[PDB]
């Protein structure tokens, strides 16, 4: 099983071998004395980029089958009546011919469908005819038992009910992401040319590298290794000893971005302005977040937690959620915000949201952030108006438990708590954090010292003037920072800064 180039997939080969090939290995005399047919179909499903094509191809080679004939879903269709399904009929011709001629001694053929869930939807247009054709041919009046057809797909739950019956697609299999052992073995297989041919240094310990890479898909490791080797060779240009060291590996590992991993760059952009503790609250909030993170990681029964942070506009709410996330160390981190969704059609919006949620269930451990609710929901007060379907998508999503032991935390923020009361959605949420704005002068002092607005004289005088002038200061941090910059790049701090602070509060 492992003598060939596939790492981490152990049980699957036992299963497939026992069901598929135990009836094609022994001499025909025994099996005909047993009088059973052969399995004529195989459906293996899972997330993309995990190695489905590879295993499918290798299966043919072990049985000494004919060369595989290959097709992908959407290319089947045409626009002339009766041409879109003729192609599905072409693929079985040669098999029919050889069966009729030779008989029971023919050589096994293999067929590969790709993206089966593009065309073969539940029936009841061209689509029904396509499905009907495939049914009528895959098992018809005439016996034809020297063939095997292989199917690869991502979503098993839309294929028509009739293809999955004992007789057409008997064996259904799942391919999941590699574990640690999988990653180590993958490295072992991949670096065989480099090992035997002696262009890999002795310092690199691939076990550490496997330990360092989480949720890597099994394809991209190839990308990593080839990039590292390219890095080393390009660095050379000398033919003394072309060795690849851990340096190149570290460089390449740093460079690549996995698909099912942290999306650091957005979250970094979110908090571009810096986190300074201008008061006592910030510490408390961050502590709360850390507590909940621990609760998620350690429990067994609390596989999901819904946490809301809410407060007045401009109070700086989203950044705290970011900071909590980036200080956690979870592998899987994605962010949904209006910026992405802008310009799309409604169907596209709902599709994106659905896919994004569906992604997380596969990984062991996940945190997922939502940027704002009223904005996504198209709220506008006059009338009022909003898109309902999106609201329902979120409402149902916020109650789904992960299908299995995998774990999820979901964080979200809003400015219109009361409005959420009024729509009657609040029952989904467990715990709430409040983020009020500044109402003090010493806070303003702390922020000016952190920003280093000016020398002490200006600072003292302005705090004095605002003390004597504004008694009930109350403004968010947004206007504070932007106003401070405006005064800095402008002239005469009292002339504007004091006035603008008064006018804003």
């Amino acid at each position: 099983f492992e003598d060939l180039g596939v790492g981490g997939l152990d049980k699957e080969f036992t299963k497939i071998f026992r069901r598929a090939f135990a009836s094609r290995i022994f001499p025909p005399s025994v099996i005909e004395k047993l009088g059973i047919s052969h399995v004529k179909g195989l459906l293996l499903y899972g997330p993309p980029g995990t190695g489905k094509t590879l295993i499918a191809r290798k299966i043919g080679t072990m049985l000494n089958a004919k060369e595989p004939k290959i097709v992908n879903g959407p290319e089947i269709l045409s626009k002339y009546v009766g041409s879109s399904e003729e192609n599905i009929r072409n693929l079985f011709k040669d098999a029919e011919a050889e069966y009729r001629a030779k008989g029971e001694e023919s050589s096994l053929h293999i067929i590969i469908f790709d993206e089966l869930d593009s065309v073969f939807k539940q029936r009841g247009g061209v689509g029904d005819n396509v499905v009907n054709q495939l049914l009528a041919k895959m098992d018809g009046v005439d016996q034809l038992n020297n063939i095997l057809v292989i199917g690869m797909t991502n979503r098993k739950d839309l294929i028509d009910s009739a293809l999955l019956r004992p007789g057409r697609f008997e064996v259904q299999v799942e391919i999941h992401l590699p574990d640690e052992k999988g990653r180590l073995q993958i490295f072992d297989i991949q670096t065989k040319k480099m090992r035997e041919n002696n262009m890999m240094s002795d310092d690199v310990n691939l076990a550490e590298l496997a330990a360092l890479t989480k949720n890597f898909s099994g394809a991209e490791i190839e990308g990593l290794v080839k990039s590292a080797s390219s890095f080393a060779i390009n660095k050379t240009v000398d033919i003394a000893k072309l060795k690849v060291t851990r340096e190149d590996f570290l460089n390449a590992l740093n460079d690549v971005t996995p698909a099912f991993g942290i999306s650091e760059e957005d979250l970094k952009t979110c908090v571009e302005g810096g986190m300074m503790l201008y008061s006592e609250r910030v510490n408390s909030i961050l502590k709360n977040g850390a507590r909940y993170v621990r609760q998620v990681r350690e429990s067994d029964k609390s596989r999901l937690v819904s946490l809301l942070i809410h407060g007045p506009a401009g109070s700086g709410k989203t950044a705290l959620a970011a900071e909590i996330a980036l200080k956690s160390g979870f592998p899987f981190i994605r962010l949904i915000s209006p910026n992405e969704l802008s310009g799309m059609s409604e169907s596209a919006k709902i599709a994106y949201i659905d896919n994004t949620f569906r992604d997380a269930y596969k990984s062991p451990l996940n945190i997922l952030v939502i940027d704002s609710l009223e904005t996504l929901v198209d709220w506008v007060p006059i009338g009022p108006r909003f898109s309902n379907n999106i609201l329902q998508m979120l409402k149902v999503a916020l109650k789904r438990k992960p299908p299995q032991d995998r774990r999820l935390l979901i964080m979200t923020t809003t400015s219109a708590y009361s409005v959420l009361q009024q729509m009657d959605i609040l029952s989904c949420f467990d715990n709430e954090i409040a983020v009020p704005n500044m109402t003090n002068l010493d806070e303003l002092n702390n922020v000016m010292i952190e920003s280093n607005f000016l020398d002490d004289a200006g600072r003292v005088k302005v705090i004095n003037e605002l003390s004597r002038s504004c008694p009930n200061f109350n403004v968010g941090i947004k206007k504070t920072l932007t106003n401070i910059e405006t005064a800095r790049h402008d002239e005469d701090p009292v002339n504007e800064l004091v006035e603008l602070m008064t006018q804003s509060a």
Partner: protein, 106 residues
């Protein structure tokens, strides 16, 4: 306690406000008072827990802690009551508006 009573006052006022701009202002002020209420709740939570821990060996300190506990519990009860009443009232208004023939079709 003062903040809770202000929340109750805004609840009563928002039931009667018909000017859309004023209602929006009431909603935002409500958001400010709710946020302040939650923050005071969290602060008192930690400070009272620390005071009860500090009073383990002095019956007078323990007494003080327990009094704080009682008063904070009463505060919580008041909050609960207010919330429940407001929910019940929002239900009757949401009944009022749509239980009748409606403006001409979309």
């Amino acid at each position: 306690d003062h903040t809770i009573n202000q929340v109750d006052s805004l609840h009563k006022r928002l039931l009667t406000e018909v000017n859309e701009e004023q209602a929006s202002h009431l909603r935002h002020s409500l958001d400010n008072f709710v946020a302040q209420a939650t923050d005071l709740q969290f602060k008192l939570k930690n400070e009272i827990k620390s005071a009860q821990r500090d009073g383990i060996h002095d019956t007078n300190k323990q007494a003080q802690a327990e009094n704080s506990r009682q008063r904070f519990l009463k505060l919580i009860q008041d909050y609960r009551i207010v919330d429940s009443n407001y929910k019940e009232e929002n239900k009757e208004q949401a009944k009022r508006q749509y239980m009748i023939i409606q403006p001409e079709a979309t």
